[PDB]
Structures are given as C-alpha cells and as structure tokens.
Amino acid sequence: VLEIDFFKTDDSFEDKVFASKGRTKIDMPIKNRKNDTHYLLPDDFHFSTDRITRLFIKPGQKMS
Amino acid sequence: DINTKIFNSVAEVFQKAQGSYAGHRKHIAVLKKIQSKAVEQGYEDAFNFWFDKLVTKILPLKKNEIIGDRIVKLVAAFIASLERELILAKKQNYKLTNDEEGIFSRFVDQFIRHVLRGVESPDKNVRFRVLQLLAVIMDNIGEIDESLFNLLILSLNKRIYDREPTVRIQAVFCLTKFQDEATRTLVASIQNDPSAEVRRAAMLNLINDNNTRPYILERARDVNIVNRRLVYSRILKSMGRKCFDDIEPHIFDQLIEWGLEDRELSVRNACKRLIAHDWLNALDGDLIELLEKLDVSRSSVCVKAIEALFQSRPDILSKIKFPESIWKDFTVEIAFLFRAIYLYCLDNNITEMLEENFPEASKLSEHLNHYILLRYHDYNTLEFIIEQLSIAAERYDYSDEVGRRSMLTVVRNMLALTTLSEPLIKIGIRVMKSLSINEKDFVTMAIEIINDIRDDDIEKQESKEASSATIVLCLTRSSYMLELVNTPLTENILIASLMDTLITPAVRNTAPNIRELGVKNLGLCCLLDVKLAIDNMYILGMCVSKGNASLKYIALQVIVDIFSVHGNTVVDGEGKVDSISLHKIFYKVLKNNGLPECQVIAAEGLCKLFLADVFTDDDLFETLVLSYFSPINSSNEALVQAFAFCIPVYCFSHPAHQQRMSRTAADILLRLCVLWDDLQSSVIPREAMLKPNIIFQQLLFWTDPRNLVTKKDTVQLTFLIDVLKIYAQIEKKEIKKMIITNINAIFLSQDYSTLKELLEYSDDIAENVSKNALDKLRNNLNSLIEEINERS
C-alpha cells in the first residue's frame, strides 16, 4: 500500500498475526507428502508415426 | 521520557527504510547507536521490544509487496552488521568492551523467538514472512544455545510440509543453511514433494556432494520440464569440467541421451547448448577432447551432439580439413568427425567445403583399404575406423569413374573376407549398392561374392555341403543384400537359386543362428513375391510356435510385414492358411508375459495391421484394448506405450475405425470394472491398473467425433447407449458412481431416433450425487427433444 506508518500505536488487532489457528489447516495432508513415483517420467520408447509406418524387417520401406 | 524517545528513534528508521534501499547503510549505522545508548541507560529491553513491534507490522504483507521485502533486508542487514563487528574483533584479535557479544546473543535469541510466534499462524502471509526473515538471517546469527536451536529445527521440520508451496520453498531455504539431517530432509523433498517449484528449490540449493549428486541429477527426468531443463541449464553447467571426472560415466551418457531425445524443445535446446557452447568453451575450443568425453566408440548420442554443435558453431565447421597428413594420426574421434562432417554437409548442401576439405573417392579408397589390411591381414579401433569411413563412402561422390572402380574393388575385397564382422558386412554391402549402376549390377556382384565363400569352403573339404559357420556368413551377407532389393523375384533369377541352394536349407536345420538367418532371408524374399509369401505362411506359423523367443521374434515380424505388403490375399482360400489360425498365434504370444519382447511385436504388429485395414475383426481389436488396460502388462512399458500411441490415431484417422471402437467399448468397459472389483478379492496379483472412471473418459475420448480429422455422425452416441444397457451389472456402487459422474463429456445437438432411445434408458435409470449428474443430462436432453419435435 502507500506505505506503513510505523509511528501508529493505534493499530488495533495487529497482534492477530500471532493467533493460534484453531481449525485452520496449515499443513499439507499426510497422504501427498510421500509418493512412490518420485515424480519422474517412465522410460520413453518414442512411438512415432515414422516408427509405425515402416516395416519391421525392411525399415527403409513404408506402408500406408 | 527516554522510553518514548527510543520508539521514535527506531520508528523513524523503519519509516524511511521501507521506501528505498538508498540509505540502508546509514539506517543500520543509526540503529546500532540507538541500541548502544539504549543499553547504556539500562533500556536494552525497550529497544528489543520496539524493534520487534515494528517488524510485526510487515509480517502479514504478501510475498510480492516490496515494502515488506525492504524491511526484511533492513532487519537482515542489522543483524549482519552487529555480527561483523564480533567477527572482526575475533579475526583481528582485539577486545570489545561494551558487551557487544552479550547484547547480540540476547537480541538474536529474543528476535527469533518473537518471529517464531507466528510460524504456525493461520495467515499464510505471516508464515511466509516468518520463514523469510529466518532464512535471510541464518548466516549471521552466530552461536545460539540448544533450546533455540531445537526450537528452530522443529519449527522448520513442520513447515517443510506446509500447505502452501510458497512457505515450503521458504522452509527449504532455511534448511539449506543447516547442511553439512537437514541434507536428508532436502533429499526427501526433492523426490516426494508434489510442488515442482519446491523440488526445484531443493535441487538448486542442495549441496553437490558425491552423496547427493545422484539425487540432484535424478531430476533430469522430473515430470516438470523446467526441472529437467535446469539440470543442463544450471546444474551441469555449474560443475563445468567436473562433469567428466566426479560424475559416473554411465549416468553421464544417460544424461546426454535424455536431454537430446527429450520430447520438449526447451529441454533439447538446453542440453544442446550445454554441449555446443558451455562444455566446448570449458575445454578451450578443443573439439577433439570434447568428443573424447562423449566417447564416440561406445555411444551413438554423439551423432546428435555434434550436429547440435555444427548448427550452433558454423565457424568451426569450415576449419576441419582432411589432407593426406591427417591419416598418419587417425583415431576414433577424428574418424567419427570424418563421417559426421561429410554427412552433415550433404544434408544441408554445404557443397562449398567438400571439394577442398575432403579427398576424392580414389584417395578415400586407399585409406579405407589400408585399415582393412591392418585388421584382417587395437582390433576394436580398427573395426570402428573402417565403419566410419564406410558410412561416408556410401554417400561419397563417385562422379569420377576412376574413384568408383577404386572404391568398388576395395569393398568387394572386404566383403570377400570370411572374418569380416557383421557391422562391416552391413555397411560394406550398402556401399556396394551406391557404387552399383542398378539392382542387377548390385545383386550379381553380391551373389558372386557369396558363392565364392561357400564354394571355397568345399575345397577345404575336398582337401558335399558347406560348413555351418560358412552358411552364417553367406546368409548374413544375403540378408543385407535382400534388404536393398526392390524388384520382383521373377526378374532376379540368381535370387531364385539362392532360395533353393542356401535359404530354405537354413530354415530347415539348426542352431538358431543359422535358422534365424534363413527366416529373415525368406521373409525378405516373401516381400517381393506374393506367391512365395502364400507358400511360406505355414512355415512361419510353425517357426513362432516351435521356436525359441528369438525365432518367434523374427518370424512374427516377417508375418506382420507380409501382411503389410500383400494384404489379406495370403489367407483364407485354397492352399492358404486360415486367418483365425494366425489370429490365435498372435493372441498366444500377446498374452505370454514370460517373454515380453515378443508382446510388443504382437501388440505393435496388430496395431499396424488394423490401421492399414488389413485387419478388421471386432473381437480381436477388443483383445488389444484389454491388453493395454490389463494389469499383467503394466510391467511392459513398451507395450503400454505402443498401444497408447496406436489406438488413439486408429479411431481419429477414419470413422469406420472409430465405429469399431464404439461397438466394443461398452463390452470393454464392462470387462475391466468386473476385473478391478475382483482385484479386491483374495486372489492377487488394486492400483496396478487404472480405475474405471479413468478408463471410461479414456474410452469416451477415443469415441468423440470431432477428434477425427465433416458431420456429427453420432458414432459416440451409439457407444453411450451401449454403456447404459451394460450398466446396472455391478456389485459395488462405487464404480457405478465412477461411470455416471464422468458423463456429460458428450457432444450433443442429430438423428432423432437414437437420442430418444438414449433418453428412454436414462429415464429407466431414475431409480448419490450421481443423481444430479444424470439429471444434468436429461434436462439438456429434454431440451433437444422439444426442439426437434417442434422443428417439423
């Protein structure tokens, strides 16, 4: 905002920042904290149209 | 009084310090005097109290607000200033006489405790500011008693699991400064935390130690693209030369391959720049040494890495010439450059530097020959060099007829060597194809070679039939020859002889090595003569049924290719095998996870045939979709990815294809819900497969009309009604809730009859929120009804 008036002792309920929190959730749920995947991608084999259109034993030739 | 004077003095500083950093150094200077005098008069606690009060005013300010950022820096600069005076007196060894140590230790301790009063506040803004203040003063708090140290670690260890990723990052920054416990806590967050920005924060700030480097570089496969890019953009760049010493060579090669083959361009370019610009510069322009690090002899990544370099640095490209003097010191690195440059310039038509930088064909034939002599008259390096030169030779210029014959007589002598490795037969024959004027000139020279090998074998015997090893050589050569033939066998007589003399005997006997070559040679001939393919369909069915996993591997590929080239004319007729017989051969292989390599060929192969319309059986197509969603095939990544790429393009390429999915998809969905519900039973080998709602909206997605590459069609419509008849056939409502909620992904608008029928069912299902979801459907539906009705 504009600025802060650090000379204000009038400021009411500024100690509210130190409240207890009762029934306000501040921790992430314990389920998500650990994941077996470790957030990596699986092995990638790169299946492309170029891959499929080609023959197995004669990769130079293509099919429709 | 003097208590209010302290407040006014400190508040005046905070009032001006929030607006600009200009006078912060002066602001610290006065704060230190206000403090010193305050303690002199016994009001140390008045200063500490008012200093805290003014800091509380910035705690609720949100992350971005500059005013909060400016006061956080003031607080940090103040503590850092007080500590510097204590460090100097210690480092310059002079005494402090005004209790500066005691005042500092007490101020810091008191201030952290005050700030920690809001570490668990409900307002996420103060929780962020609290950890921000902590993070930015950690370096300058000095030595603290154990009670405060325990309080800090416990407070942070709870904030590492804060609900906001913004606070968690700040929790990370705090714990980084306690590294050497805290190190394992950060590795725990680098792998397990769901937010990508915190994994990024942990990664970038985690100490790069032999213990931690594996976990840091592990993020080269992070699901987020930035985290992957940053591995090359910063991590690997920070290390510099240590990327070739303190990094395991096996993971090293895997990092380049990953970056250069990544599916995203940002990651690819990031890895490219690391190789072409950052590394190369770290090695002082020495391209040869850079290639020594990539290890051309034991890796193919360098093909992309050097082409990546050539694009980035065309200035170096014109500087690599090849005079006759280079061959005196020819190594694997230089040899790889020879092919890499020559092929790169042909592809991008930089013919400028081929007439002056490379020898003519006649001189290249001498050098290629030379190395052939050294090897077949370190053996690995020689074979490698021969391969690199031969690769270039295949694409060399033989306009000068002198160079064509020279090179030709060189490779013919090479291919005549009975000891020639397979990789050098492969490339040796491809060169002879480029040198030949036409196919007939190519096969005549090739078969002439082959026959000499088998005939010479019969003189050592007449010191009857050729040895088994000798047959492996002839079939290896012929297999690479027949791969390059493209005319019907009717035109090539000599290939008809090779069939009788060599190929069909190889299919007859054993070991595999000789039988596997016979099948590949046969399959390649079947691609040229439809009748030959008809007359060998029974043989190939036997090869997969009675052969080792390797023979199944080849014979299956042959079968799929014969179908791709000739279609359904090799099946179902007089003198022809039955389609349903081959369908069973594929199915038996497809579901045998004992050998998963073959499942991909069956899985992929069948997709190739349905896509070309050569296959069009509804029941078989359904076996594919189910093997994709199957729990047994989760282990086979290649199979899942094969089906994942094929069956979506099948539907979306032509509505007849998608029309097939619609008829099956209801039965498919049925047979996977019944499945998952039975994975709860006491018979296992659940999360090993998707849950029905995923499967449904997956199925429904394939059936959507507009995803095809011109009218509404209602192909999807017919799928849904089927899904509703099957419905109600379930033990657990949980999966009924799954199937029902994911409706409304439909495209609705024609064809009155169908939609009215759809409404009739939905009304019948008017038997928990699932009810709402279904009601959403009928109101939208009932509108379509009155609209069409009144249209008349």
Author numbering:
A (entry chain C): 458 to 521
B (entry chain A): 8 to 187, 205 to 401, 414 to 498, 556, 568 to 789, 793 to 816, 822 to 861, 864 to 881, ...
What does the paper say about this structure?
Condensin protein complexes coordinate the formation of mitotic chromosomes and thereby ensure the successful segregation of replicated genomes. Here, we identify a direct DNA-binding site in the eukaryotic condensin complex, which is formed by its Ycg1Cnd3 HEAT-repeat and Brn1Cnd2 kleisin subunits. A peptide loop of the kleisin subunit encircles the bound DNA and, like a safety belt, prevents its dissociation. Firm closure of the kleisin loop around DNA is essential for the association of condensin complexes with chromosomes and their DNA-stimulated ATPase activity.
To gain detailed insight into the nature of the DNA binding site, we solved crystal structures of the Ycg1–Brn1 subcomplex of Saccharomyces cerevisiae (Sc) and of the homologous Cnd3–Cnd2 subcomplex of Schizosaccharomyces pombe (Sp) to 2.8 Å and 2.6 Å resolution, respectively. Both structures are strikingly similar and reveal a harp-shaped conformation of the HEAT-repeat subunit, with the kleisin subunit winding along the concave surface of the HEAT-repeat solenoid. The peculiar curvature of Ycg1 and Cnd3 has its cause in three discontinuities in the directionality of the solenoid formed by the 19 HEAT-repeat motifs. The Brn1 kleisin subunit makes extended contacts with the inner surface of the Ycg1 harp, burying a total surface area of 3,754 Å2. Through multiple hydrophobic, electrostatic, and hydrogen bond interactions with the HEAT-repeat subunit, Brn1 forms a rigid “bridge” between the two Ycg1 lobes. One of the two molecules in the asymmetric unit of the Ycg1–Brn1 and Cnd3–Cnd2 crystals shows additional electron density for a segment that corresponds to a long helix (α1) in the N-terminal region of the kleisin subunit. This helix and the succeeding well-ordered turn stack onto HEAT motifs 16 and 17 and onto the α4 segment of the kleisin via several highly conserved aromatic residues in a manner that resembles a “latch” that has been inserted into a “buckle”. Through the interaction of latch and buckle regions, the kleisin subunit adopts a loop configuration. The absence of density for the latch segment in half of the complexes suggests that the α2 to α4 segments of the kleisin subunit are sufficient for complex formation with the HEAT-repeat subunit. Mapping of the electrostatic surface potential onto the Sc Ycg1–Brn1 structure revealed that the wide groove between the two shoulders of the Ycg1 harp and the Brn1 bridge displays a high degree of positive surface charge.
